[PDB]
Protein backbone atom coordinates (compact mmCIF):
# COMPACT_ATOMS: atom_id res chain seq x y z
CA UNK A 1 0.00 0.00 0.00
CA UNK A 2 0.95 3.47 -0.34
CA UNK A 3 0.96 3.72 3.86
CA UNK A 4 3.89 2.28 6.20
CA UNK A 5 2.82 -0.53 9.00
CA UNK A 6 4.19 2.00 11.33
CA UNK A 7 1.05 4.81 9.70
CA UNK A 8 -1.25 1.72 9.68
CA UNK A 9 -0.74 0.35 13.05
CA UNK A 10 -1.52 4.22 14.36
CA UNK A 11 -4.66 4.23 12.73
CA UNK A 12 -5.23 1.26 14.83
CA UNK A 13 -5.13 2.58 18.34
CA UNK A 14 -7.99 2.94 20.69
CA UNK A 15 -9.24 6.85 20.80
CA UNK A 16 -7.17 8.80 23.59
CA UNK A 17 -9.56 9.38 26.32
CA UNK A 18 -8.94 12.97 27.39
CA UNK A 19 -11.03 12.10 30.64
CA UNK A 20 -9.87 8.87 32.25
CA UNK A 21 -13.04 8.56 33.96
CA UNK A 22 -15.37 9.75 31.27
CA UNK A 23 -17.59 6.68 30.82
CA UNK A 24 -17.60 6.19 34.69
CA UNK A 25 -18.77 9.97 35.15
CA UNK A 26 -20.94 9.58 32.43
CA UNK A 27 -22.62 6.59 33.66
CA UNK A 28 -22.38 7.94 37.02
CA UNK A 29 -24.17 11.41 36.22
CA UNK A 30 -26.92 9.77 34.40
CA UNK A 31 -27.52 7.16 36.76
CA UNK A 32 -28.12 9.42 39.29
CA UNK A 33 -30.80 12.05 37.56
CA UNK A 34 -33.29 8.92 38.20
CA UNK A 35 -32.25 7.29 41.19
CA UNK A 36 -32.89 10.83 42.88
CA UNK A 37 -36.34 11.16 40.97
CA UNK A 38 -39.48 9.85 43.14
CA UNK A 39 -41.40 8.47 39.40
CA UNK A 40 -38.83 6.18 38.97
CA UNK A 41 -38.73 4.46 42.57
CA UNK A 42 -40.90 1.38 42.10
CA UNK A 43 -39.23 0.80 38.19
CA UNK A 44 -36.01 -1.48 37.70
CA UNK A 45 -34.40 -0.56 35.06
CA UNK A 46 -30.16 -0.41 33.78
CA UNK A 47 -27.88 2.11 31.94
CA UNK A 48 -25.21 0.94 29.84
CA UNK A 49 -23.06 2.18 27.33
CA UNK A 50 -23.88 0.97 23.60
CA UNK A 51 -22.26 1.79 20.46
CA UNK A 52 -18.88 2.40 19.29
CA UNK A 53 -18.10 3.74 22.93
CA UNK A 54 -19.70 -0.15 24.30
CA UNK A 55 -17.32 -2.20 21.71
CA UNK A 56 -13.97 0.25 22.09
CA UNK A 57 -14.09 0.96 18.03
CA UNK A 58 -14.50 4.87 18.56
CA UNK A 59 -11.62 6.36 16.59
CA UNK A 60 -12.35 10.10 17.97
CA UNK A 61 -12.00 11.41 21.66
CA UNK A 62 -14.71 14.00 20.29
CA UNK A 63 -17.17 11.58 19.80
CA UNK A 64 -20.75 11.19 21.04
CA UNK A 65 -20.61 8.02 24.07
CA UNK A 66 -24.32 6.35 23.46
CA UNK A 67 -26.18 5.32 26.96
CA UNK A 68 -29.16 3.43 26.91
CA UNK A 69 -31.45 3.91 30.26
CA UNK A 70 -32.99 0.19 29.77
CA UNK A 71 -36.87 0.02 31.98
CA UNK A 72 -36.98 -3.73 32.79
CA UNK A 73 -39.51 -3.81 34.82
CA UNK A 74 -41.93 -3.40 31.97
CA UNK A 75 -40.65 -4.63 28.45
CA UNK A 76 -41.59 -5.86 24.99
CA UNK A 77 -41.50 -9.65 23.83
CA UNK A 78 -41.67 -11.53 20.58
CA UNK A 79 -43.08 -15.04 21.10
CA UNK A 80 -43.57 -17.96 19.37
CA UNK A 81 -46.49 -18.26 16.45
CA UNK A 82 -49.58 -18.23 18.16
CA UNK A 83 -48.16 -17.13 21.63
CA UNK A 84 -49.66 -13.89 24.08
CA UNK A 85 -48.65 -12.32 26.43
CA UNK A 86 -51.24 -14.78 28.99
CA UNK A 87 -49.11 -17.38 27.79
CA UNK A 88 -46.30 -16.67 29.94
CA UNK A 89 -48.45 -14.82 32.88
CA UNK A 90 -47.94 -11.05 31.56
CA UNK A 91 -49.77 -7.94 31.16
CA UNK A 92 -49.78 -5.38 28.86
CA UNK A 93 -47.53 -3.35 30.88
CA UNK A 94 -47.97 -1.05 33.61
CA UNK A 95 -46.10 2.27 31.80
CA UNK A 96 -46.02 2.96 28.07
CA UNK A 97 -43.29 4.16 25.80
CA UNK A 98 -43.72 7.69 25.83
CA UNK A 99 -45.05 7.44 29.48
CA UNK A 100 -41.41 6.28 30.33
CA UNK A 101 -39.53 8.74 27.93
CA UNK A 102 -41.42 11.88 29.45
CA UNK A 103 -40.27 10.40 33.24
CA UNK A 104 -36.80 10.21 31.81
CA UNK A 105 -36.84 13.74 30.26
CA UNK A 106 -37.79 15.23 33.59
CA UNK A 107 -35.13 13.31 35.11
CA UNK A 108 -32.38 14.64 32.69
CA UNK A 109 -34.15 18.15 33.05
CA UNK A 110 -33.70 18.55 36.73
CA UNK A 111 -30.48 16.87 36.50
CA UNK A 112 -29.04 18.90 33.06
CA UNK A 113 -31.12 22.44 33.05
CA UNK A 114 -34.19 22.41 29.75
CA UNK A 115 -31.50 24.24 28.05
CA UNK A 116 -29.01 21.46 27.53
CA UNK A 117 -31.11 18.41 26.90
CA UNK A 118 -32.40 18.17 23.22
CA UNK A 119 -34.35 15.58 22.13
CA UNK A 120 -33.54 14.06 18.73
CA UNK A 121 -35.02 11.52 16.56
CA UNK A 122 -33.38 8.42 18.29
CA UNK A 123 -31.51 10.22 21.04
CA UNK A 124 -32.07 12.87 24.16
CA UNK A 125 -28.71 14.74 23.47
CA UNK A 126 -27.36 16.06 26.97
CA UNK A 127 -24.49 18.67 26.72
CA UNK A 128 -23.77 19.28 30.20
CA UNK A 129 -20.99 21.07 30.69
CA UNK A 130 -21.45 21.54 34.36
CA UNK A 131 -21.42 17.68 35.23
CA UNK A 132 -18.65 17.26 32.40
CA UNK A 133 -21.57 15.17 30.77
CA UNK A 134 -21.85 14.87 26.62
CA UNK A 135 -23.77 11.99 25.59
CA UNK A 136 -26.89 10.99 23.74
CA UNK A 137 -29.11 8.72 26.02
CA UNK A 138 -31.55 6.15 24.23
CA UNK A 139 -34.85 5.85 26.80
CA UNK A 140 -35.33 1.97 25.49
CA UNK A 141 -37.20 -0.78 27.17
CA UNK A 142 -36.19 -4.07 27.39
CA UNK A 143 -37.07 -6.37 24.57
CA UNK A 144 -37.31 -10.33 25.27
CA UNK A 145 -37.27 -12.13 22.09
CA UNK A 146 -38.23 -15.97 22.89
CA UNK A 147 -38.75 -17.01 19.85
CA UNK A 148 -35.04 -17.07 18.27
CA UNK A 149 -34.41 -20.01 20.42
CA UNK A 150 -38.00 -20.98 20.81
CA UNK A 151 -38.35 -21.07 24.70
CA UNK A 152 -41.72 -21.22 26.34
CA UNK A 153 -39.38 -20.84 29.85
CA UNK A 154 -40.05 -17.08 30.56
CA UNK A 155 -36.61 -16.62 31.91
CA UNK A 156 -35.27 -17.89 28.95
CA UNK A 157 -34.85 -15.43 26.13
CA UNK A 158 -32.40 -13.41 24.18
CA UNK A 159 -32.26 -9.93 25.23
CA UNK A 160 -32.68 -7.04 23.36
CA UNK A 161 -33.67 -3.23 23.40
CA UNK A 162 -36.93 -1.57 21.77
CA UNK A 163 -37.91 2.25 21.52
CA UNK A 164 -39.46 4.72 19.22
CA UNK A 165 -37.57 7.49 16.84
CA UNK A 166 -39.21 10.88 17.26
CA UNK A 167 -41.83 9.67 13.87
CA UNK A 168 -42.87 6.83 15.98
CA UNK A 169 -41.08 4.23 14.13
CA UNK A 170 -39.66 0.98 15.56
CA UNK A 171 -36.04 0.32 16.16
CA UNK A 172 -35.09 -2.82 17.71
CA UNK A 173 -31.24 -3.58 18.57
CA UNK A 174 -29.35 -6.13 20.43
CA UNK A 175 -26.30 -3.93 21.74
CA UNK A 176 -25.29 -6.54 24.53
CA UNK A 177 -25.26 -9.35 21.95
CA UNK A 178 -23.72 -7.08 19.91
CA UNK A 179 -21.17 -6.29 22.44
CA UNK A 180 -20.99 -10.08 23.75
CA UNK A 181 -19.97 -10.78 19.88
CA UNK A 182 -17.12 -8.51 19.49
CA UNK A 183 -15.43 -9.36 22.50
CA UNK A 184 -15.58 -12.91 21.91
CA UNK A 185 -13.76 -11.63 18.33
CA UNK A 186 -11.40 -9.77 19.65
CA UNK A 187 -10.96 -12.84 22.01
CA UNK A 188 -10.48 -15.12 19.14
CA UNK A 189 -7.92 -12.91 16.73
CA UNK A 190 -5.70 -11.74 19.74
CA UNK A 191 -7.50 -8.43 19.77
CA UNK A 192 -6.66 -7.51 16.21
CA UNK A 193 -10.18 -7.55 15.05
CA UNK A 194 -11.20 -4.06 16.87
CA UNK A 195 -8.06 -2.95 15.54
CA UNK A 196 -8.92 -3.56 11.89
CA UNK A 197 -12.37 -1.65 12.81
CA UNK A 198 -10.36 1.24 13.95
CA UNK A 199 -8.14 1.14 10.75
CA UNK A 200 -11.07 1.16 8.12
CA UNK A 201 -12.91 4.02 9.45
CA UNK A 202 -10.30 5.89 9.74
CA UNK A 203 -9.41 5.21 5.98
CA UNK A 204 -12.93 5.82 5.34
CA UNK A 205 -12.62 8.86 6.98
CA UNK A 206 -9.27 10.10 5.30
CA UNK A 207 -10.74 8.99 1.32
CA UNK A 208 -13.41 11.32 2.47
CA UNK A 209 -11.19 14.29 3.58
CA UNK A 210 -8.94 13.95 0.82
CA UNK A 211 -12.27 13.37 -1.73
CA UNK A 212 -11.14 10.12 -2.97
CA UNK A 213 -14.76 8.90 -1.66
CA UNK A 214 -17.58 9.80 -0.25
CA UNK A 215 -20.58 7.68 0.33
CA UNK A 216 -23.00 9.17 3.53
CA UNK A 217 -24.72 5.36 3.39
CA UNK A 218 -21.21 3.42 4.79
CA UNK A 219 -21.43 4.12 8.28
CA UNK A 220 -19.00 3.21 11.45
CA UNK A 221 -21.59 0.36 12.36
CA UNK A 222 -21.63 -0.95 8.83
CA UNK A 223 -17.93 -1.12 8.93
CA UNK A 224 -17.79 -2.46 11.80
CA UNK A 225 -20.09 -5.61 10.99
CA UNK A 226 -18.52 -5.79 8.01
CA UNK A 227 -15.12 -6.61 9.41
CA UNK A 228 -16.59 -8.66 11.82
CA UNK A 229 -17.90 -11.13 8.77
CA UNK A 230 -14.04 -11.51 8.04
CA UNK A 231 -13.00 -14.91 9.34
CA UNK A 232 -10.36 -14.91 12.14
CA UNK A 233 -7.86 -16.44 9.81
CA UNK A 234 -7.51 -13.13 7.31
CA UNK A 235 -6.83 -11.80 11.00
CA UNK A 236 -4.83 -14.03 12.44
CA UNK A 237 -2.42 -15.41 9.54
CA UNK A 238 -0.76 -11.88 8.45
CA UNK A 239 1.84 -10.48 9.73
CA UNK A 240 1.55 -6.75 9.23
CA UNK A 241 -1.83 -4.28 8.27
CA UNK A 242 -1.18 -3.92 5.09
CA UNK A 243 -1.26 -7.83 4.45
CA UNK A 244 -4.49 -7.59 6.54
CA UNK A 245 -6.04 -4.38 5.12
CA UNK A 246 -5.13 -6.42 1.59
CA UNK A 247 -6.94 -9.86 2.04
CA UNK A 248 -9.69 -8.04 4.15
CA UNK A 249 -10.76 -6.02 0.81
CA UNK A 250 -10.26 -9.48 -1.40
CA UNK A 251 -12.49 -11.06 1.16
CA UNK A 252 -15.46 -8.50 0.91
CA UNK A 253 -15.31 -8.06 -2.58
CA UNK A 254 -15.67 -11.96 -3.27
CA UNK A 255 -18.12 -12.25 -1.04
CA UNK A 256 -20.48 -9.39 -2.53
CA UNK A 257 -19.54 -11.09 -6.04
CA UNK A 258 -20.97 -14.91 -5.00
CA UNK A 259 -23.97 -13.98 -2.92
CA UNK A 260 -22.42 -14.97 0.63
CA UNK A 261 -22.87 -11.69 1.62
CA UNK A 262 -27.11 -12.56 1.26
CA UNK A 263 -26.45 -14.51 4.73
CA UNK A 264 -24.13 -12.25 6.84
CA UNK A 265 -25.96 -10.89 9.92
CA UNK A 266 -24.64 -8.12 11.97
CA UNK A 267 -22.46 -8.57 15.13
CA UNK A 268 -25.66 -9.64 16.75
CA UNK A 269 -26.19 -12.38 15.08
CA UNK A 270 -29.93 -11.36 15.10
CA UNK A 271 -30.90 -9.05 11.65
CA UNK A 272 -28.77 -9.83 8.34
CA UNK A 273 -26.40 -7.01 7.34
CA UNK A 274 -28.08 -6.78 4.05
CA UNK A 275 -31.62 -6.11 3.60
CA UNK A 276 -33.82 -3.85 2.07
CA UNK A 277 -34.72 -1.88 4.90
CA UNK A 278 -30.92 -0.35 5.73
CA UNK A 279 -29.67 2.75 4.50
CA UNK A 280 -26.61 1.00 2.77
CA UNK A 281 -26.90 -1.89 -0.22
CA UNK A 282 -24.45 -4.35 -1.55
CA UNK A 283 -23.83 -1.70 -4.66
CA UNK A 284 -22.49 1.20 -1.68
CA UNK A 285 -20.20 -1.65 -0.19
CA UNK A 286 -18.60 -2.79 -3.81
CA UNK A 287 -18.10 0.91 -4.45
CA UNK A 288 -16.63 1.47 -0.74
CA UNK A 289 -13.79 -1.64 -1.11
CA UNK A 290 -13.03 -0.59 -4.63
CA UNK A 291 -12.23 2.99 -3.67
CA UNK A 292 -10.73 1.71 -0.65
CA UNK A 293 -8.54 -0.96 -2.93
CA UNK A 294 -7.67 1.96 -5.44
CA UNK A 295 -6.85 4.56 -2.66
CA UNK A 296 -4.23 2.24 -0.80
CA UNK A 297 -2.63 1.89 -4.07
CA UNK A 298 -2.51 -2.15 -3.52
CA UNK A 299 -2.22 -2.02 -7.71
CA UNK A 300 1.38 -0.22 -7.70
CA UNK A 301 1.11 3.34 -9.49
CA UNK A 302 3.28 2.24 -13.10
CA UNK A 303 6.71 2.94 -11.75
CA UNK A 304 5.75 3.88 -8.23
CA UNK A 305 4.66 7.44 -9.14
CA UNK A 306 0.85 8.14 -8.69
O1 LIG B 1 -27.90 -2.36 16.55
C1 LIG B 1 -27.82 -1.43 15.80
C2 LIG B 1 -26.97 -0.36 16.12
C3 LIG B 1 -26.89 0.74 15.25
N1 LIG B 1 -27.64 0.73 14.11
C4 LIG B 1 -27.58 1.74 13.18
O2 LIG B 1 -26.23 2.58 13.21
C5 LIG B 1 -26.53 3.83 13.49
C6 LIG B 1 -25.61 4.40 14.56
O3 LIG B 1 -25.88 3.75 15.81
P1 LIG B 1 -24.73 3.78 17.01
O4 LIG B 1 -25.17 2.93 18.19
O5 LIG B 1 -24.43 5.19 17.51
O6 LIG B 1 -23.43 3.11 16.27
P2 LIG B 1 -21.91 3.51 16.57
O7 LIG B 1 -21.02 2.28 16.53
O8 LIG B 1 -21.77 4.29 17.89
O9 LIG B 1 -21.49 4.43 15.32
P3 LIG B 1 -21.23 6.09 15.31
O10 LIG B 1 -21.99 6.76 16.52
O11 LIG B 1 -19.74 6.15 15.48
O12 LIG B 1 -21.76 6.39 13.92
C7 LIG B 1 -28.10 3.70 14.06
O13 LIG B 1 -28.71 5.04 14.13
C8 LIG B 1 -28.67 2.84 13.23
O14 LIG B 1 -28.69 3.36 11.83
P4 LIG B 1 -30.09 4.08 11.36
O15 LIG B 1 -31.07 2.89 11.42
O16 LIG B 1 -30.36 5.15 12.42
O17 LIG B 1 -29.98 4.78 10.02
C9 LIG B 1 -28.43 -0.33 13.82
O18 LIG B 1 -29.07 -0.29 12.81
N2 LIG B 1 -28.57 -1.37 14.66
MG1 LIG C 1 -22.81 6.06 18.25
Same mark, same amino acid.
Given at each position: ?????????????????????????????????????????????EVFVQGSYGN?????????????????????SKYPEGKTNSD??????? *????????? *?????????????? =??? @????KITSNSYRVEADCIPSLLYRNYEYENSSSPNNYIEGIK?????????????????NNGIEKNNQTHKNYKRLVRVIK????????? @????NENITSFLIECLIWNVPNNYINDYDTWDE???? =???????????????????????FYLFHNNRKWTSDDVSSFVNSLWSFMEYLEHHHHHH
Open positions: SKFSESTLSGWTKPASVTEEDRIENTISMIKSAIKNDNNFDNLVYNTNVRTNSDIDVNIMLTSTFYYGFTDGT *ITYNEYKNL *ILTALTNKFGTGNV =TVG @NKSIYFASDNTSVVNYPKVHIRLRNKMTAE @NHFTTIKQ =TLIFIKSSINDNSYKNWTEVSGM
